[PDB]
């Protein structure tokens, strides 16, 4: 399952109060760019309207049948490429979201979710961004690990 288009739109529907709106937007923009520099995909932000990828912070039951679980545990989930709910990413509004080394770092988690929104599943490689469990890595000048590059390149090009 892959996107049949290269320029995709995204919309941040709501925010987490833990960070400024500028910080949430920055975390998201930077997360999309990591995949962009390794594939033919281009991401355009819209403020209202129907975007391909909807992004939102939700708590527990939130209408899609996969409830979140409060602090820790499940951090976020994302739908595979598709119309409607397809490609959308939900973040557990009950987590502590940061832009530091403290758990958790929104940019790293968003980056992981977007891999899913683009059609990638988990990697068994512990150094991959797509590894199932969260681990902090310096974000300052972060680049996609080689395993993940192999991943989107195998899907798109
Ligand atoms: Ca949780
Ligand atoms: Ca969608
Ligand atoms: Zn959800
Ligand atoms: Zn995942």
From Swiss-Prot:
Superkingdom classification of source: Eukaryota
Residues engaged in binding Ca(2+) 2: 69-70, 72, 74, 92, 95
Binding site for Ca(2+) 1: 52, 84, 86, 88
Location (main, coarse): cytoplasm
Keywords in alphabetical order: Calcium, Collagen degradation, Disulfide bond, Extracellular matrix, Glycoprotein, Hydrolase, Metal-binding, Metalloprotease, Protease, Repeat, Secreted, Signal, Zinc, Zymogen
Residues annotated as the enzyme's active site: 113
UniProt GO molecular function: endopeptidase activity; metalloendopeptidase activity; peptidase activity; serine-type endopeptidase activity; tumor necrosis factor binding; zinc ion binding
Tissue note: Neutrophils.
Keyword Metal-binding: yes
Location in the cell: Cytoplasmic granule; Secreted, Extracellular space, Extracellular matrix
Binding site for Zn(2+) 1: 62, 64, 77, 90
Glycan-modified residues: 7, 99, 141
Keyword field contains Signal: yes
UniProt-listed GO biological process terms: cellular response to lipopolysaccharide; collagen catabolic process; endodermal cell differentiation; extracellular matrix disassembly; extracellular matrix organization; positive regulation of microglial cell activation; positive regulation of neuroinflammatory response; positive regulation of tumor necrosis factor production
Residues bound to Zn(2+) 2: 112, 116, 122
GO CC terms: collagen-containing extracellular matrix; extracellular region; extracellular space; specific granule lumen; tertiary granule lumen
Family: Belongs to the peptidase M10A family.
Domain notes: The conserved cysteine present in the cysteine-switch motif binds the catalytic zinc ion, thus inhibiting the enzyme. The dissociation of the cysteine from the zinc ion upon the activation-peptide release activates the enzyme.
Job of this protein: Can degrade fibrillar type I, II, and III collagens.
UniProt protein name: Neutrophil collagenase
Source species: Homo sapiens (Human)
